[PDB]
Amino acid sequence: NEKVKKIIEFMDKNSIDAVLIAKNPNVYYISGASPLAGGYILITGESATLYVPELEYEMAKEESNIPVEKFKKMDEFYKALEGIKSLGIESSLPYGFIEELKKKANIKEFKKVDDVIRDMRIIKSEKEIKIIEKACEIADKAVMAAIEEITEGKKEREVAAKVEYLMKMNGAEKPAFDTIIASGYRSALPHGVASDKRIERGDLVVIDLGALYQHYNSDITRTIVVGSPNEKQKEIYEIVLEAQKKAVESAKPGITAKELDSIARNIIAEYGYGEYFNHSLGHGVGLEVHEWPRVSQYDETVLREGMVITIEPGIYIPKIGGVRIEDTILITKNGSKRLTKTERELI
Amino acid sequence: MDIMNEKVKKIIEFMDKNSIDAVLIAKNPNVYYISGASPLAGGYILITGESATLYVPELEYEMAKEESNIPVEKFKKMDEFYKALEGIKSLGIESSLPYGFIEELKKKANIKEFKKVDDVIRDMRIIKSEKEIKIIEKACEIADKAVMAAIEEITEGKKEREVAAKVEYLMKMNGAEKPAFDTIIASGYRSALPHGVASDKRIERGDLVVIDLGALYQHYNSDITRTIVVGSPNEKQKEIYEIVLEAQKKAVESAKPGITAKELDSIARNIIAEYGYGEYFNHSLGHGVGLEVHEWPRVSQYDETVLREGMVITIEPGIYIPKIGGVRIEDTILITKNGSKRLTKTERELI
Ligand SMILES: C[As](C)(=O)[O-]
Numbered sequence: 001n002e003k004v005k006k007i008i009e010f011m012d013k014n015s016i017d018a019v020l021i022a023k024n025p026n027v028y029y030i031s032g033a034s035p036l037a038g039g040y041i042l043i044t045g046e047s048a049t050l051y052v053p054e055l056e057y058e059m060a061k062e063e064s065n066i067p068v069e070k071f072k073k074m075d076e077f078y079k080a081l082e083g084i085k086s087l088g089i090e091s092s093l094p095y096g097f098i099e100e101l102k103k104k105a106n107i108k109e110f111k112k113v114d115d116v117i118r119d120m121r122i123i124k125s126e127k128e129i130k131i132i133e134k135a136c137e138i139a140d141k142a143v144m145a146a147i148e149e150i151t152e153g154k155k156e157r158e159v160a161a162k163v164e165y166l167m168k169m170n171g172a173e174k175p176a177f178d179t180i181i182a183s184g185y186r187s188a189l190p191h192g193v194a195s196d197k198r199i200e201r202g203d204l205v206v207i208d209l210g211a212l213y214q215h216y217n218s219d220i221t222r223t224i225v226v227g228s229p230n231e232k233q234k235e236i237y238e239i240v241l242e243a244q245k246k247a248v249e250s251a252k253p254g255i256t257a258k259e260l261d262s263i264a265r266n267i268i269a270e271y272g273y274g275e276y277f278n279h280s281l282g283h284g285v286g287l288e289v290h291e292w293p294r295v296s297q298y299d300e301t302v303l304r305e306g307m308v309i310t311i312e313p314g315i316y317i318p319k320i321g322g323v324r325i326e327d328t329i330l331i332t333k334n335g336s337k338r339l340t341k342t343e344r345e346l347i
Numbered sequence: 348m349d350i351m352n353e354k355v356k357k358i359i360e361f362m363d364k365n366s367i368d369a370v371l372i373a374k375n376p377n378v379y380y381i382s383g384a385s386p387l388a389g390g391y392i393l394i395t396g397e398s399a400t401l402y403v404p405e406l407e408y409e410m411a412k413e414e415s416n417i418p419v420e421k422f423k424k425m426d427e428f429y430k431a432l433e434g435i436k437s438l439g440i441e442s443s444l445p446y447g448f449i450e451e452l453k454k455k456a457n458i459k460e461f462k463k464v465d466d467v468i469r470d471m472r473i474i475k476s477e478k479e480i481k482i483i484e485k486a487c488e489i490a491d492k493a494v495m496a497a498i499e500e501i502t503e504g505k506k507e508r509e510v511a512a513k514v515e516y517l518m519k520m521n522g523a524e525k526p527a528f529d530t531i532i533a534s535g536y537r538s539a540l541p542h543g544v545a546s547d548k549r550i551e552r553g554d555l556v557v558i559d560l561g562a563l564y565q566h567y568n569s570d571i572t573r574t575i576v577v578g579s580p581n582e583k584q585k586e587i588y589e590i591v592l593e594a595q596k597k598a599v600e601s602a603k604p605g606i607t608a609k610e611l612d613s614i615a616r617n618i619i620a621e622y623g624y625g626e627y628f629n630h631s632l633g634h635g636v637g638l639e640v641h642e643w644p645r646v647s648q649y650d651e652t653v654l655r656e657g658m659v660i661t662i663e664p665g666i667y668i669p670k671i672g673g674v675r676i677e678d679t680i681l682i683t684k685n686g687s688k689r690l691t692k693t694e695r696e697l698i
Pocket residue numbers: 177208219289312326
């Protein structure tokens with residue numbers, strides 16, 4: 001396939017004899033198969049083969065677009081690698097595995113192939129975009145359900161369980177990540193995963209969730225308030241809303257991820273809340289919840305049509321609470337498109 | 348010097364005996380096991396001969412400081428972390444540490460040599476304390492409740508994924524953080540797929556249905572598999588079922604200290620092979636369970652680990668007939684002084 005072809009081209013330019021792909025999302029991206037257990041793709045100058053343990057063979061044989069080989073013990077796999085001098089690998093390959101490759105496969109050199117994997121996955125195909133949009137649609141439904149479920153006295157975890165159930169009933173494999181239902185002081189926390197805390201009147205409630213649908217992810221955050229907001233809560237909400245909207249409106253091909261982050265960050269900084277916006281503006285979304293590019297002050301990746309990223313500025317104040325508004329957006333030919341469509345002005 | 352816990356000291360012992368200058372622990376389950384902290388972002392424990400420190404990003408400091416039993420240090424940029432590592436000659440690392448990170452350590456921390464510390468981590472985690480066993484047993488209680496709920500929910504017409512959604516909700520409402528792994532509800536031809544995660548397929552009468560699920564509860568895992576038939580089973584379904592049941596029961600009864608994992612795997616495998624279904628029992632008999640659903644030891648033909656009191660493993664033989672159906676019966680068990688204890692207690696003879 002075209003993906004294997006691009007890897008072979010990269011191998012030729014970088015004097016790599018063979019490439020090993022082992023990370024789940026990359027194995028699926030290339031072969032179309034997703035063995036839960038350990039699956040490995042070996043790409044040579046003229047072939048691509050997926051190796052899987054026997055228990056995953058039947059599933060892999062019916063889902064893979066490249067030849068499949070099964071093995072009983074890892075020794076058979078290494079035997080298939082003996083002879084390779086320079087091996088291209090993912091930066092995620094674990095130490096234990098690399099040491100086994102040196103000892104049992106006699107690999108002489110390792111080179112990172114992350115660049116070619118990134119260059120491919122960072123631009124979504126029309127088909128991938130449609131799956132991501134469906135995942136976002138499911139996430140939108142989950143956020144609305146969360147709002148309905150929220151009431152004084154209910155545990156954050158109960159709301160989370162209820163909406164995760166709804167997402168799965170809508171076709172999701174599972175949540176894209178641990179659901180965040182953070183109320184009151186918890187809304188100002190770094191990663192407020194739903195807890196046993198009970199929601200209280202006057203609480204700001206951050207709802208950050210996503211659905212994993214047919215291998216692709218979605219990501220959305222909306223913040224609401226139980227009852228009426230006080231002056232401070234309303235103020236930080238208005239600023240985050242302004243920053244989020246301006247950043248989304250500014251997203252387009254040609255500008256750097258850093259430039260985009262600066263748009264939202266400068267708005268928040270000018271209002272005097274710069275020290276309370278403690279994370280990046282966003283991240284890419286695809287086969288993984290967090291992927292390329294990183295939308296921050298440290299990544300100047302030039303945006304291009306086909307990229308899918310989140311725009312999620314926020315302001316977090318100890319005890320008082322926090323506000324975050326996040327959308328998963330698609331970079332189009334001339335601008336952007338919000339894939340998550342839930343109303344943002346909720347406070 | 349620091350007053351360090353016994354887990355840290357066991358690592359220090361290993362360090363001295365293996366000429367290692369310092370040890371870096373970065374995998375979540377290990378960081379929790381050693382410090383009690385659960386940094387969602389990147390937490391790193393650095394152990395030296397006289398100190399143990401947990402380094403975490405700013406967005407993790409406050410919580411880590413509250414849950415960690417060892418001194419916590421925060422950093423704004425990784426360069427700050429690598430600076431702390433400067434001077435280390437031989438660094439002990441986990442077999443899970445990624446290539447990219449190791450290359451960074453080589454250049455920014457100028458680490459000269461790396462050595463595996465997997466053996467000491469394994470030696471500690473492979474034997475569960477009475478405290479850990481109680482947590483795992485409760486997770487198994489939650490898993491048992493989920494399996495019983497699944498059986499009651501499974502009927503002709505039901506979508507596999509919907510059954511999964513219902514029992515995963517039940518587990519959470521019963522205290523579980525979340526499922527230990529993607530719930531498997533494999534019906535009909537799908538029961539022939541060992542890892543047939545619940546799908547959009549609708550269950551039909553006469554279907555063999557494999558239910559494999561588990562709960563992550565207070566950091567520990569549970570794992571259970573029961574197979575049922577919707578309606579009356581035919582003779583061929585009953586045949587493979589009786590064989591798997593016989594093999595599973597015999598293996599559980601044979602589990603005791605002194606036997607190797609390979610010898611235990613052979614008990615179940617030889618039974619299934621004698622019936623001529625050896626080619627269809629395409630996976631190991633089991634795996635250890637603890638902070639991770641899959642851990643030491645591997646109960647297979649390729650593991651010589653001698654079982655000891657305190658080990659927690661699964662016993663899950665199965666037979667899978669391609670495109671037709673399959674059967675798997677799995678229990679999480681505890682190795683006792685001279686036998687075993689079934690932590691998962693749901694009835695096994697369900698057809
Ligand atoms: C909490 As998130 C998946 O938006 O980084």
